Amino acid sequence: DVLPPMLTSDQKPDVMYADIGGMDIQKQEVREAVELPLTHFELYKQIGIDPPRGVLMYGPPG
C-alpha cells in the first residue's frame, strides 16, 4: 500500500478584500504577483513572462 500522507494553512483566514479599505494599488500589485499566476497563467504565457514569485511590502509600523 501507499498511504496518502499539515502544519500551516489550515486555519482558514477570515479577513476579506471588502474588509481591507483603500490600498487599491497595493492590492493590485500583490494580486498580480500572488493570485493571477495561479488563476490565469495564460495571460502570462501570452506576454511570455516569468511570473514574479516574490514581493516585498514597505511601510510604517502599521
Nearer to other proteins, 8 or 46 (CB): 46
Instruction: Answer yes or no whether residue 43 interacts with other proteins by CB under 8 A.
Output: no
CA nearest neighbour of 59 among 13, 21, 16, 23: 23
Residue span binding other proteins (CB under 8 A) among the ranges 1-9, 20-28, 31-39, 42-50: 42-50
Nearer to other proteins, 5 or 22 (CB): 5
CA nearest neighbour of 52 among 39, 33, 38: 33
The x, y and z cell numbers of residue 3, run together, are: 498511504
Q: Where do we find the cell 502599521?
A: 62
Q: Which chain residues interact with other proteins by CB under 8 A?
A: 46-49
